[PDB]
Structure formats: C-alpha cells, structure tokens
From Swiss-Prot:
Database matches in Pfam families: Lys
UniProtKB keywords: Allergen, Antimicrobial, Bacteriolytic enzyme, Disulfide bond, Glycosidase, Hydrolase, Secreted, Signal
Additional note from the record: Lysozyme C is capable of both hydrolysis and transglycosylation; it also shows a slight esterase activity. It acts rapidly on both peptide-substituted and unsubstituted peptidoglycan, and slowly on chitin oligosaccharides.
Cysteines engaged in disulfide bonds, as pairs: C6-C127, C30-C115, C64-C80, C76-C94
Transmembrane segment boundaries: none
Subunit structure: Monomer.
Tissues with expression: In the egg white and polymorphonuclear leukocytes.
Name of the top EC class for this enzyme: hydrolase
Record-linked PROSITE patterns: GLYCOSYL_HYDROL_F22_1 (PS00128), GLYCOSYL_HYDROL_F22_2 (PS51348)
Residues the record marks as active site: E35, D52
Organismal lineage: Eukaryota, Metazoa, Chordata, Craniata, Vertebrata
Record-given protein name: Lysozyme C
Amino acid sequence: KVFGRCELAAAMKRHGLDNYRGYSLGNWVCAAKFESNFNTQATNRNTDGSTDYGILQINSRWWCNDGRTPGSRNLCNIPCSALLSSDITASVNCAKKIVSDGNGMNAWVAWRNRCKGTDVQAWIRGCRL
C-alpha cells in the first residue's frame, strides 16, 4: 500500500504517535516520506545482508525476526514480515520502542537527513485532523 500523506497522518494519530515521547505527528509523517515514500512494502537490501522493512524502514539486525536467527535480538517481538503489512500497527508499535532506545528519531537516517531541523508541521498542513 502507498499511503497518502494525510491518510498516514490520520493512521499514525489513531495509533497514538502524535507527540509520543514529544515527537510531533509531522516528524513521523516526514520520516515515513523519506524512509519509504509512504510505501508499506518498501525494502532496502543492505550491502551487510540485513534488510530495512516497511513504511519506517526498520532494520532486521535488532528489531524483528527475519527467520535467520530465532531466539536472538528481535526486540519488537515480531517477524520482519509484520513490518510489510498494509496496516501500520506492527511498524508503529516497533517505532515506539526504537524512538525510546536512546537516540530519539535519529535512529532514522532519512529523518536526520531530510526532516530534522525543518518545520515538520508542513507535513500535516491541509490534513485538518
């Protein structure tokens, strides 16, 4: 599924991300724009052999089980396949863990490079949620 910008804002708001740990909804929408272009099926086959999955490009080394090493890591307690669903539940719940892990939203490289330091309120302009 490719979300519209305000469609994703509404979904993320329903899942309690607006101002979660102090990060504004526009931060989360901007992150999804530059991580995945709002595509729930996004994948990035890294050179190191790990994969970033889904609308927030969550990495398989730490956060999900890709089938290669069960009983190891998997800090979000989900198969990486859950990050590829058209419904954002698993990605939101796992993003809440990541953003609490001590680097805030600097855990998302595309957020750091394209959103950080900007007026991210623009990402919810016109959504009038």
